[PDB]
């Protein structure tokens, strides 16, 4: 029953997966497919079923409920909140929930604004008048913010670029596994280096919590925490900033509307999340029992991917779904997930995106793409919507 090989779909599917998902949705909610790595997974498509499944407790995130074995490098890192169910998820999330409320994140606005102002200064100083938004803004800003929060020294941040690149588009399945092993070894060394140093960063606080009471946070969960907060704190926000400006720049009429009325900025970032959000499919879910989806039963322990990208093109929920419309009703989009695993970072992601978008539009007079929208290259990863590069001009 694998009705679709995702590996045999080419850059056409990478750049525009939506017709493929829409044809699946017309048949039903759940479809067995083959990942590019040859693994069999289920896709859940359509807004209503995707939203329901994201929050449905019958779909676990704990790999003890998955029949697909974890690799050695993955098993070193899986004791994290996103790959946990209650009660473990509940305890782990409580440890950092307070750090990421909208009120605490707003205390970061001065620093974020200062980072954005600096990065945009560097861009506008270009010897030509052109730049890659990927290298000039979308990559440096989130990695800088999350590194300062988790106390990652500046010389160490370069390796995160390489590791993330190996996670998104590895040369072979081994290079991603190798990147995970190096990242885990580094994080374990970083964790130990905070001991006794009285750091005020979030990682140092977590290390102390674990050292004080292994029943509140084990050493395995401490490494899982650092990992999850750094990876999820990074590559999704990079692509929100890139995908979001690609959306504005590829729709010059909406770029003009927003530039003419910055009070639309908040809705525009929400439509940015709706229209081309960085998460194409949610992270792995495993039914704890066979689950019947309108006649399609998924066996217990199979892998289930909720295709957020298709949910956001469901016309019943988002009329004229293929139109990027910054004044559209975006209520209930799933770009941050839904349920107990809803993104803990959403206020910080939104803060970074809003400041970055505003700064580009207020300070780059005639901002425009440097290539045509169809010339842009997208990474083939079915989990992520990401641009290889974003050439711009002003
Ligand atoms: C600003 C930096 C961010 C940090 C630190 C962060 C952190 C996290 C963490 C720790 C989780 C797991 C929560 C749990 O399991 O209870 C999570 C979930 C999630 N985040 Fe974020 N996040 C960030 C930004 C983003 C962005 C920009 C997006 C995409 C628009 C995003 C999308 C998601 C989604 C979809 C999930 C749920 C995955 C699923 O249910 O399988 N996050 N995030
Ligand atoms: C929260 C939405 C983003 O997901 C993540 O960043 C989470 C925290 C994450 O780090 C994992 C889900 C990674 O996914 C894969 O990592 C591979 C190296 C191993 C793989 N295996 C178990 C099948 C799986 O865990 C993440 C590094 C994946 C890449 C593509 C990514 O950046 C995804 C981001 C969002 C889905």
Domain boundaries, the chain: 6-393
273 CA from centroid of ligand 1 (Å): 13
125 CA from centroid of ligand 1 (Å): 33
371 CA from centroid of ligand 1 (Å): 31
Which ranges in the chain belong to alpha helices (H)? 10-15, 18-27, 47-54, 72-75, 88-94, 102-106, 109-124, 133, 140-149, 157-168, 173-194, 202-212, 219-232, 235-250, 252-259, 265-276, 308-311, 346-363
Q: Which ligand is nearest to the CA of 269?
A: 1
343 CA from centroid of ligand 1 (Å): 4
283 CA from centroid of ligand 2 (Å): 7
Give residue for tokens 């004080």.
Answer: 212
Farthest CA pair distance, the chain? 61
Method: X-ray
Instruction: Measure the CA–CA gap between 92 and 227, rounded to whole angstroms.
Output: 13
The residue nearest atom 6 of ligand 2, judged by CA position, is 232
Instruction: Measure the CA–CA gap between 164 and 384, rounded to whole angstroms.
Output: 12
Ligand 2 atom with least separation from CA of 282 = 36
Breaks (C-N over 2.5 A) in the chain follow: none
CB atoms within 10 A of CB 157: 16
Phi-psi map region of 26: left, alpha, beta (phi>0 left; psi -120 to 50 alpha): alpha
Write 214-219 long-range contacts (CB < 8 A, 24+). 216/91, 216/95, 217/92, 217/95, 218/79
Ligand 1 atom with least separation from CA of 239 = 27
Rg (CA), the chain: 21
Cβ of 203 less than 6 Å from ligand 2: no
CB 201 within 8 A of CB 149: yes
The three-state secondary structure class of 60 is strand
Instruction: Measure the CA–CA gap between 391 and 132, rounded to whole angstroms.
Output: 4
125 CA from centroid of ligand 2 (Å): 35
Q: Which ligand is nearest to the CA of 240?
A: 1
Cβ of 73 less than 6 Å from ligand 2: no
Instruction: Measure the CA–CA gap between 242 and 225, rounded to whole angstroms.
Output: 26
Instruction: Measure the CA–CA gap between 310 and 23, rounded to whole angstroms.
Output: 10
End-to-end CA distance of the chain: 50
The residue nearest atom 32 of ligand 1, judged by CA position, is 336
Write 86-91 long-range contacts (CB < 8 A, 24+). 86/340, 88/62, 89/61, 89/340, 89/341, 90/340, 91/216
232 CA from centroid of ligand 1 (Å): 6
Instruction: Measure the CA–CA gap between 280 and 80, rounded to whole angstroms.
Output: 21
- C-alpha 184: how far from chain center: 20
Q: Which of 35, 33, 30, 40 is nearest to 67 (CA)?
A: 40
**HSE of 372 in the Cβ direction (CA atoms, 13 Å)?**
2
Q: Which of 329, 308, 317 is nearest to 385 (CA)?
A: 308
Cβ of 231 less than 6 Å from ligand 2: yes
Q: Which of 380, 391, 356 is nearest to 144 (CA)?
A: 356
Range 6-393: architecture per CATH? Orthogonal Bundle (1.10)
Q: Which of 12, 7, 5 is nearest to 31 (CA)?
A: 5
Instruction: Measure the CA–CA gap between 160 and 182, rounded to whole angstroms.
Output: 10
* Phi/psi at 392 (5° precision): -135, 175
Q: Which of 305, 341, 300 is nearest to 65 (CA)?
A: 300
Calculate helix-pair angle for 346-363, 252-259, nearest 10 degrees.
90
Resolution at which this structure was determined, Å: 1.9
Cβ of 271 less than 6 Å from ligand 2: no
E-assigned strand segments in 255-326: 286-287, 291-293, 296-298, 304-306
Phi-psi map region of 294: left, alpha, beta (phi>0 left; psi -120 to 50 alpha): left
Instruction: Measure the CA–CA gap between 84 and 54, rounded to whole angstroms.
Output: 14
* Ligand 1 pocket, residues with Cβ under 6 angstroms: 54, 81-82, 93, 228-229, 232-233, 236-237, 240, 273, 277-279, 282-283, 335-337, 341, 343-345, 348-349
Q: Which of 78, 150, 383, 386 to mutate to test the pocket of ligand 2 (most atoms within 8 A of CB)?
A: 383
The residue nearest atom 12 of ligand 1, judged by CA position, is 82
Q: What Å distances lie between residue 81 and 41, 150, 226, 345, CA to CA?
A: 22, 17, 11, 13
Sign of CA dihedral 57, 303, 349, 81: positive
The three-state secondary structure class of 42 is strand
The residue nearest atom 43 of ligand 1, judged by CA position, is 343
Cβ of 133 less than 6 Å from ligand 2: no
Cβ of 176 less than 6 Å from ligand 2: yes
Instruction: Measure the CA–CA gap between 372 and 391, rounded to whole angstroms.
Output: 10
388 CA from centroid of ligand 1 (Å): 21
């Amino acid at each position: 029953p694998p009705v679709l090989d995702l590996g045999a779909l080419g850059q056409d599917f990478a750049a525009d997966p939506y017709p493929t998902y829409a044809r699946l949705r017309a048949e039903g909610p759940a479809h067995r497919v083959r990942t590019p790595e040859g693994d069999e997974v289920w896709l859940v498509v359509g807004y209503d079923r995707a939203r329901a499944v994201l929050a449905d407790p019958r779909f676990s995130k704990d790999w003890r409920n998955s029949t697909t074995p974890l690799t050695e490098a993955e098993a070193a890192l899986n004791h994290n909140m996103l790959e946990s169910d209650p009660p473990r998820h509940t305890r782990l999330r409580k440890l950092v929930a307070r750090e990421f409320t909208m009120r605490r994140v707003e205390l970061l606005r001065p620093r974020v604004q200062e980072i954005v102002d600096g990065l945009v200064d560097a861009m506008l100083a270009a010897p030509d008048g052109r730049a890659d938004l990927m290298e000039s803004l979308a990559w440096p800003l989130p990695i800088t913010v999350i590194s300062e929060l988790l106390g990652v020294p500046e010389p160490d941040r370069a390796a995160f670029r390489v590791w993330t690149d190996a996670f998104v588009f590895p040369d072979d399945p081994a290079q991603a596994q190798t990147a995970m092993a190096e990242m885990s070894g580094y994080l374990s060394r970083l964790i130990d280096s905070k001991r006794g140093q009285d750091g005020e960063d979030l990682l140092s606080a977590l290390v102390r919590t674990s050292d004080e009471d292994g029943s509140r946070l084990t050493s395995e969960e401490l490494l899982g925490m650092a990992f999850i907060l750094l990876v999820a704190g990074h590559e999704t926000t990079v692509n929100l900033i890139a995908n979001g400006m690609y959306a504005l720049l590829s729709h010059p009429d909406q770029l003009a509307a927003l530039r003419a009325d910055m009070t639309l900025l908040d809705g525009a970032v929400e439509e940015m999340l709706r229209y081309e959000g960085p998460v194409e499919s949610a992270t792995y879910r495993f039914p704890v029992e066979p689950v019947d989806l309108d006649g399609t039963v998924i066996p217990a322990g199979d892998t289930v991917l909720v295709v957020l990208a298709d949910a956001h093109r469901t016309p019943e929920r988002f009329p004229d779904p293929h139109r990027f419309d910054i004044r559209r009703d975006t209520a209930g989009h799933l770009a941050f997930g839904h349920g107990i695993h809803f993104c803990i970072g959403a206020p910080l992601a939104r803060l970074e995106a809003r400041i970055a978008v505003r700064a580009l539009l207020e300070r780059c007079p005639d901002l425009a793409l440097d290539v045509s929208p169809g010339e842009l290259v997208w990474y083939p990863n079915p989990m992520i919507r990401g641009l290889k590069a974003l050439p711009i001009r002003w």
